[PDB]
Design an enzyme around this catalytic site. Structure first.
Site, PDB file in Angstrom:
ATOM      1  N   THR C  28     126.218 -35.632  70.579  1.00  0.00           N
ATOM      2  CA  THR C  28     125.784 -36.418  69.430  1.00  0.00           C
ATOM      3  C   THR C  28     125.084 -35.529  68.404  1.00  0.00           C
ATOM      4  OG1 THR C  28     123.687 -36.902  70.517  1.00  0.00           O
ATOM      5  CG2 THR C  28     125.506 -38.452  70.879  1.00  0.00           C
ATOM      6  N   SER C  29     125.274 -35.856  67.127  1.00  0.00           N
ATOM      7  CA  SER C  29     124.684 -35.142  65.991  1.00  0.00           C
ATOM      8  C   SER C  29     123.161 -35.044  66.221  1.00  0.00           C
ATOM      9  CB  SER C  29     125.031 -35.916  64.714  1.00  0.00           C
ATOM     10  OG  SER C  29     124.425 -35.397  63.539  1.00  0.00           O
ATOM     11  N   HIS C  87     121.718 -28.270  71.367  1.00  0.00           N
ATOM     12  CA  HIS C  87     121.823 -28.991  72.632  1.00  0.00           C
ATOM     13  C   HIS C  87     121.938 -27.899  73.697  1.00  0.00           C
ATOM     14  CE1 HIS C  87     122.511 -33.221  71.698  1.00  0.00           C
ATOM     15  NE2 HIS C  87     123.327 -32.881  70.715  1.00  0.00           N
ATOM     16  N   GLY C  88     121.628 -28.247  74.936  1.00  0.00           N
ATOM     17  CA  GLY C  88     121.754 -27.268  75.998  1.00  0.00           C
ATOM     18  C   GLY C  88     121.563 -27.769  77.410  1.00  0.00           C
ATOM     19  N   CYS C 129     117.721 -28.865  75.717  1.00  0.00           N
ATOM     20  CA  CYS C 129     117.476 -29.390  77.060  1.00  0.00           C
ATOM     21  C   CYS C 129     117.700 -28.258  78.110  1.00  0.00           C
ATOM     22  CB  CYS C 129     118.454 -30.539  77.356  1.00  0.00           C
ATOM     23  SG  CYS C 129     118.050 -32.126  76.614  1.00  0.00           S
TER      24      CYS C 129
END
Lengths: 4, 232, 232, 4
Positions: C28-29, C87-88, C129
């Protein structure tokens, strides 16, 4: 000198 | 701001010292480990920690101890310190009869579990390899995993060095800086000095070229929310 | 004791801001990431870093960028800062089109690989994350990997939070703290303050009950060998 | 609040  | 280090007691300092490994494990004897255990026992007795050494524990006896210790009433204690001396791999340290996951060991002290230690610093010092890479040198609601500090003797995935007669580079250096600066510097600052000490002063010696002339850098993993003064 | 921070330039501060992802990734954006990119740029400009913002980079554009940057002559520069906003998962951050190993990015800056940064502080600030764990709360030669600091936004294995409007809890705090203290405190001490801020003041609000009332604790990983001050 |  030795490693763990 | 900084942790309240003025409770009745400073807290207990457990030292797990594994020198003898089962034939099964194919794990050699950690000569020099006693030098370390001794050095720690005295450094921490001087900062007023109630020390306890436990020798050659099996993977099984380790969890039993951490479980029992996490159930004690740490109310009048300021902190908790646990030293693990053994063989290991990333995320793992060996008991005499086999490898225990460190996550399993530290989880007993999370804020939700050991309510007696919530808001107080939980220190874990670890001497053991974190893998097999070699460094060849150059040139109020709070998080349950909060107030934890992991003083690792080496960078993730690397070898950790020990001298058969002097003990581990990291433990000698840690005990050294601790007695030289615990009366003036903040913990993070003492560990950065340790980092520079093991980084610049040591280098391995071996007749086996693969293990000769290798460097090492400890690794501080801080989830502390306040400054830690041993003197206050 | 202290890193020499008096070279002609403070150094480069590269901010990789990934907001939009390929539909194939299912990511997600990242609303609010723009506030972070902005706040960081102004914060490090005041500290005199030469700032470079890069937006929406593919996993291969991140690597080629890090590689060209490590080939730059950092002689007249005191340090290097790299912020990755994305993100991660544990050990990986996402490029716009897919996952990138963190070890692949940092490796260009190793003591033996980037010779004009050997002995200089290399800072990696990571907002991502590190797993799907939820915190519910309670109450001569030098090592090649020496001189690295990893200011992770969360604990190993846990979620990292972001406000679609205000930006990530971690970057909000990092910048506030640096505005307030960069002219008085040592970096590790400023970072400990960030830990206290995110741990005490932020709690997630969510209509999805599984993500509501969650806590976060950043995580400092230091292989630094000296104290770092952004003032002279 | 959303997770990264």
């Amino acid at each position: 000198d030795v490693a763990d | 701001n900084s942790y309240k280090m003025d409770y009745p007691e400073m807290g207990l300092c457990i030292i797990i010292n594994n020198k003898n490994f089962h034939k099964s494990t194919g794990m050699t004897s950690r000569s020099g480990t006693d030098v370390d255990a001794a050095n720690l026992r005295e450094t921490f007795r001087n900062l007023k920690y109630e020390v306890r050494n436990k020798n050659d524990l099996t993977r099984e006896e380790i969890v039993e101890l951490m479980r029992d210790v996490s159930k004690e009433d740490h109310s009048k204690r300021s902190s908790f310190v646990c030293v693990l001396l053994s063989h290991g791999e990333e995320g793992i340290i060996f008991g005499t009869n086999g490898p225990v996951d460190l996550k399993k060991i530290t989880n007993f002290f999370r804020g939700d579990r050991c309510r007696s230690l919530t808001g107080k610093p939980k220190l874990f010092i670890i001497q053991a390899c974190r893998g097999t890479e070699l460094d060849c040198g150059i040139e109020h609601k709070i998080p349950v995993d909060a107030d934890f500090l992991y003083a690792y003797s080496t960078a993730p995935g690397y070898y950790s060095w020990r001298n058969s007669k002097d003990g581990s580079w990291f433990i000698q250096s840690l005990c050294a800086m601790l007695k030289q600066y615990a009366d003036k510097l903040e913990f993070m600052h003492i560990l950065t000095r340790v980092n520079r000490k093991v980084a610049t002063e040591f280098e391995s010696f071996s007749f086996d070229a693969t293990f000769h002339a290798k460097k090492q850098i400890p690794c501080i993993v801080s989830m502390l929310t306040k400054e830690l003064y041993f003197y206050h």
